[PDB]
């Protein structure tokens, strides 16, 4: 679990960050790259291959 938090806890790029006042909180998907597993180029089988060794 610690090796995947290096990428998965990276802060996302915020476009309109200069505005202030709106008291909404962005979710975890739009604050950090929590959809990086869906962008896996070989499909989810690399995560299956990673879990297979445990």
């Amino acid at each position: 679990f610690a090796w995947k938090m290096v990428v998965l806890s990276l802060p996302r790029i915020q476009s309109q960050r200069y505005q202030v006042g709106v008291h909404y909180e962005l979710t975890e998907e739009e604050k950090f790259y929590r959809n990086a597993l869906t962008r896996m180029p070989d499909g989810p089988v690399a995560l299956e291959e990673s879990y297979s060794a445990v």
């Binding site: 679990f1 938090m5 998965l8 909404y24 979710t27 929590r34 597993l37 995560l47 299956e48 879990y51």
Partner: protein, 299 residues
């Protein structure tokens, strides 16, 4: 004769519903970090009579259909009869609770056909679960246990401290609560499931949940009867309910019908649209200055 081990816990729910923070307080750990994909944990189950300690592993699945292929490592074919399934529903967003239930049920139904179990073993398991349902103490019906899996299942409702936010800034009444509890009682009756209402902010039925897992996974003695009056601490175990214990909730229905669908009465609130598609698109220069050439010629 030592106590059996290898008892499996299968947690299913949407992401952000608070499954990890529920499991770290059921187990007793301080910081349960929400690792994504699958989470691995075990339950500290022990008895004071035989002085024996049993390890019962916990498998948590995140709310993502892209990770539905991870279930092969969580449960196998041989680990199926030693698996107790907890289905997690979060009524903090009460508009989409049994949707997650039926989609995880369909996922479990297609996944239980993936290893191609022979028709004798799961029929024996279904017969065992049917006789365990019929022998509860404090043929079947038309819609009772019609979608049985053969293994003990459970539906646990989370954030019971989040009942007041439903009433105050959404203008909910007791008919609102009765409508959502009737549908899940129908689901529990259809699937042979139980219901424990639990809040971790208000610390309600957490040890009652823990004793229920210990009893349903190890045959421990159970004495707590069904609770229906306390709407924040509802306890409906397996075998208590029937087609007439759901009909008592239809008396307070003055504007809604029990036979109606779900999404017609309770609607999810519309949310903020990404209002940025107004954009700015300056024209191509060629057509723009042909138009300006026409304006040059016409005047």
């Amino acid at each position: 004769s030592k106590l059996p081990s290898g008892k499996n816990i299968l947690v299913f729910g949407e992401d952000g519903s608070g499954k990890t923070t529920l499991m770290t307080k059921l187990q007793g750990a301080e910081h349960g970090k929400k690792g994504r994909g699958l989470e691995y944990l075990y339950l500290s189950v022990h008895d004071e009579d035989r002085d024996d300690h049993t390890r019962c592993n916990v498998w948590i699945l995140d709310g993502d259909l892209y990770h539905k292929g991870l279930l092969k490592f969580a449960v196998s074919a041989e680990s199926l009869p030693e698996t107790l399934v907890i289905f997690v529903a979060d009524m903090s967003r009460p508009w989409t609770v049994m949707e997650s239930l039926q989609k995880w049920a369909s996922v479990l139904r297609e996944h239980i056909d993936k290893m191609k179990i022979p028709p004798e073993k799961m029929r024996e398991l279904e017969r065992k679960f049917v006789k365990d349902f019929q022998d509860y103490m404090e043929p079947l019906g038309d819609n009772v246990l019609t979608h049985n899996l053969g293994i003990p299942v459970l539906v646990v409702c989370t954030k019971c401290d989040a009942v007041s936010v439903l009433e105050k800034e959404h203008d909910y009444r007791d008919e609102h609560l009765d409508f959502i509890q009737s549908h899940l009682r129908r689901f529990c009756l259809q699937y042979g499931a139980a219901l424990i209402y639990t809040s971790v902010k208000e610390e309600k039925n957490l040890d009652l949940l823990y004793k229920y897992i210990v009893h349903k996974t190890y045959g421990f003695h159970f004495t707590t009867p069904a609770l229906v009056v306390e709407k924040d601490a509802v306890f409906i175990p397996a075998g208590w309910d029937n087609e007439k214990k759901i009909a008592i909730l239809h008396e307070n229905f003055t504007t809604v019908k029990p036979e109606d669908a779900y999404e017609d009465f309770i609607v999810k609130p519309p949310v903020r649209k990404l209002v940025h598609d107004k954009e700015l698109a300056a024209e191509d220069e060629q057509v723009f200055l042909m138009k300006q050439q026409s304006l040059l010629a016409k005047q």
